[PDB]
């Protein structure tokens, strides 16, 4: 009877980078909204909606790497963001924190979203070390201000991309891995929202665990054969690329996904290994779905939050 609309806004350079690789990826019954003071990248985005801030600030330019230009701009567009952002239950907010527009104008957009009803997530990047000192202190207060303006927060740091390359691992290779962290978060609660599941979950317990919450980890894990449940479940909580570990969460969305074949004892598994590696006394909201199309695999889903 409710259905919740889920939209993903990128803001400056990186995030609309995101938002272009997940549209090529193929999202579905998401909206996207692209943000930017850069009229060029803004032009090739392939969001349905496309905002252009700062145009008297800019003349078209993005920020150059000053984070008040971006906030200036977000705030001298906020009804055109209020517009484009009306009727979303949740908003993800992606960008890269160090430049002028993500640094400035995501807090803003996220600002706004929240003011608007939406429950309201971040997920931004740090910048690699060998940009140098300013560019983290930039981002870092970013990071301060997006923790003081969304529901909850993701931050990956870019050092991490460099644990999971090669020495020959295409750039654009690893952006992707990046983009995965946001892109399988809103798939996992579009899903967990589209089907009806036998321990039944919806967007109301997503608010819940997510709402005024802090720091967030999102985390999908797949797996078949034997010890299935317990892979999935270390697969869905261990990301190399976060700043924020499974340690300390107090709050857990965990969803389970199998086949007829899905057995009582291997969800406990599954349930106790988020408990185990979390070691907290988690409060959890826990759902399981049957997928008779499923034979062998199962899908963990963990959204972790209370981080305390
Ligand atoms: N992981 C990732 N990081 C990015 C990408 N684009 C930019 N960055 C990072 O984001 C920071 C800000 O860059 P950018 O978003 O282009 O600046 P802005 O347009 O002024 O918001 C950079 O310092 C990089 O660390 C991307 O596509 N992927
Ligand atoms: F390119 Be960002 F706007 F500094
Ligand atoms: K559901
Ligand atoms: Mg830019």
Do not use: C, W, Y
Request: charged residues 20%.
């Amino acid at each position: 009877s409710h259905m919740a609309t889920l939209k993903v806004i990128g803001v400056g350079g990186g995030g609309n980078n995101a938002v272009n690789r997940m549209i090529d990826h193929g999202m579905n019954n998401v909206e996207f909204i692209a943000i930017n003071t850069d009229g060029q990248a803004l032009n090739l985005s392939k969001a349905e909606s496309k905002i252009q801030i700062g145009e008297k600030l800019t003349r078209g330019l993005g920020a150059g790497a000053n984070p008040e230009i971006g906030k200036k701009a977000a705030e001298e567009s906020r009804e055109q963001i209020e517009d484009a952002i009306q009727g979303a239950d949740m908003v993800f907010v992606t960008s890269g924190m160090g430049g002028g527009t993500g640094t400035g104008a995501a807090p803003v957009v996220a600002k706004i979203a929240k003011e608007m009803g939406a429950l309201t997530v971040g997920v931004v990047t740090r910048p690699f070390s060998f940009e140098g000192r300013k560019r983290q202190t930039q981002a870092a207060a970013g990071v301060e201000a997006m923790k003081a303006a969304v529901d909850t927060l993701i931050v990956i740091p870019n050092d991490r991309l460099l644990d999971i390359v090669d020495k020959s691992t295409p750039m654009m290779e690893a952006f992707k891995e990046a983009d995965n962290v946001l892109r399988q978060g809103v798939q996992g609660i579009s899903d967990l929202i589209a089907v009806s599941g036998e321990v039944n979950l919806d967007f109301a317990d997503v608010k819940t665990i997510m709402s005024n919450q802090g720091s967030a980890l999102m985390g999908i894990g797949v797996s078949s054969g034997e010890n299935r449940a317990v892979e999935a479940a270390k697969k869905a909580i261990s990301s190399p690329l976060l700043e924020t570990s499974i340690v300390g969460a107090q709050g857990v969305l965990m969803n389970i996904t199998g086949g007829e074949s899905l057995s009582l004892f291997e969800a406990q598994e599954a349930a106790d290994i988020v408990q185990d590696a979390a070691d907290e006394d988690v409060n959890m909201i826990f759902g399981t779905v049957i997928n008779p199309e499923l034979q062998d695999e199962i899908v963990v889903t963990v959204i972790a939050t209370g981080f305390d």
